[PDB]
Symmetry: C2
Subunit: 317 residues, 2 copies
């Protein structure tokens, strides 16, 4: 019986992975809360790996946030993510944990990358200023994995998800991510019977979204693949795997779909006097598809279930 440690099991991705592994008896979960185990503490992390008998590690713990948070606390974002990555990855190796899955982010890609973005786009150009500190920490996480694989013959894999959404997301008013921000605004506009909802921009830019449960499924899939199969579809120094739908849709289509899901009858208005971001941004998921994994949750379906979750948990935001 495989003993699995999911670091950061209370976060959005961590909890999604936990939900799916809990639904099988060939796995026994070892979980620690931030209060029980301080991930920034090297000694604490090493002590934990020495005391427990871990077979696999899902490194889902991270200091994440929106546009405001990343620009307001840059030092906390780079430092904490670097320490969490280093502590877990090194302690794991020191205690013979051969399997590990590192969950990265989509922010690691160059601001002006070629679309769709293949894995080889990594480090090909300058990063988005807003995400620079966080992105550098994530890239260092991937390179730590590759370096331990090369030097010690470890099996430390990594996956880079596109924009995620789903239950346990940050629905607070402070969150800048488009899906939870719009679900919240359309909900209140519907409740207050507001004539319209104005969204900044033209609505033309294209984005890719993946439900967190599909993310968890792909993660576990990649983690459980045969080592020879994984090696065959990656390179030692270009080992990460993009996880997404490969399907893009305009912000206009997204907003309009959220309005429908929530039952909003007012008007959705795009203020084109405000600037748009990059025109298009999506991942090339060829590598993932060749590994035999395809997403199941469609946008409309994922937004409907996510909204349902928000309804039963709104007294938390």
């Amino acid at each position: 019986k495989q003993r699995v440690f999911i670091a950061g099991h209370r976060g959005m991705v961590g909890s999604a992975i936990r939900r799916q592994l809990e639904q099988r008896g060939d796995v026994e979960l070892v979980l620690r809360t931030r209060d029980e185990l301080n991930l920034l503490d090297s000694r604490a992390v090493h002590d934990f790996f020495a005391s427990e008998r871990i077979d696999q590690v899902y490194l889902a713990a991270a200091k994440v946030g929106g546009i405001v948070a990343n620009n307001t606390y840059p030092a906390d974002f780079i430092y904490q993510n670097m320490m969490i990555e280093s502590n877990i990855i090194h302690a794991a190796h020191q205690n013979d944990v051969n399997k590990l899955l590192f969950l990265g982010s989509s922010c690691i890609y160059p601001k002006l990358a070629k679309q769709p973005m293949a894995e080889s786009e990594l480090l090909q150009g300058t990063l988005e200023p807003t995400n620079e500190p966080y992105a550098i920490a994530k890239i260092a996480g991937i390179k730590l994995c590759e370096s331990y694989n090369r030097q010690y013959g470890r099996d430390y894999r990594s996956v880079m998800p596109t924009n995620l959404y789903g239950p346990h997301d940050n629905f607070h008013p402070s969150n800048s991510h488009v899906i939870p921000a719009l679900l919240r605004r359309f909900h209140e506009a519907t409740a207050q019977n507001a004539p319209d909802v104005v969204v900044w921009g033209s609505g033309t830019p294209m984005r890719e979204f993946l439900h967190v449960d599909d993310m968890a499924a792909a993660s576990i899939h990649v983690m459980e693949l045969a080592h020879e199969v994984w090696l065959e579809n990656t390179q030692p120094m270009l080992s990460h795997i993009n996880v997404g739908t490969g399907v893009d849709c305009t912000i206009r289509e997204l907003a309009q779909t959220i309005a429908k899901v929530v039952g909003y009858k007012g008007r959705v208005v795009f203020d084109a006097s405000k600037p748009d971001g990059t025109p298009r941004k999506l991942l090339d998921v060829t590598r993932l598809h060749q590994l035999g994994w395809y997403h199941e949750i469609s946008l409309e379906a994922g937004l409907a279930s996510t909204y349902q979750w928000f309804l039963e948990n709104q007294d938390r935001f």
Copy 2:
């Protein structure tokens, strides 16, 4: 009286900085050996900064090595450099040390960068595979500095040196750096009266070299510049300063000059059946020159004094 901590004062660059600061009484040096203070230990480093009263920090400690070492121990190179950087930079901030100088490397630049390489070439393309792990750690070091400067209003500066040489370099046979490797080979070839010395390649590629004492001088200069002057010549997210001569010379000229300095009378032969590296590689030192610093040690002069040092210390290699 300024209390200065030079991390890694026994290394090549650390010791060069120490030699120059020791020659002035307006500075009091706080030094710890690797045995006295384990830089990889967070608690130890924080305890040190809490107990001592540091005003400035020269972060010259690093896990460095040649071509063989970087490809053989990639995990040790990325992990150790990341921990040393994170520990010192964070402990410094936690204990109110407002001034810090981070010594990077030239390896951080893209393999196919535009020549000469300006600071803005950082993160513009893929890294040299051999140096990838070490380079990622160094870049993370620069971004930590920038992030603490942005978030906490710190004054954490950084300098990226070109190829260095001088006393306390690694003259062991295992070292791949061209200057110490060639000084050693020409010395023995001269002693053994060998008819010739064969060097791989055509001798046409161009490289830049800086004596470690000039490096130390530039470092202290940049560290001591007025904050307003430094801010005026850098950007918050592009804050590093290239340190070098801006002068390049062929490997052929370098080899030929070393032969002369050592008194070798045989023939220097370049085997063109072996591949060369990139044709040219040197730093754009415009930013440094505008800050009013210019190197003093010329190549011939620097090699002669470095050889002299090697002679008086050969019973160590």
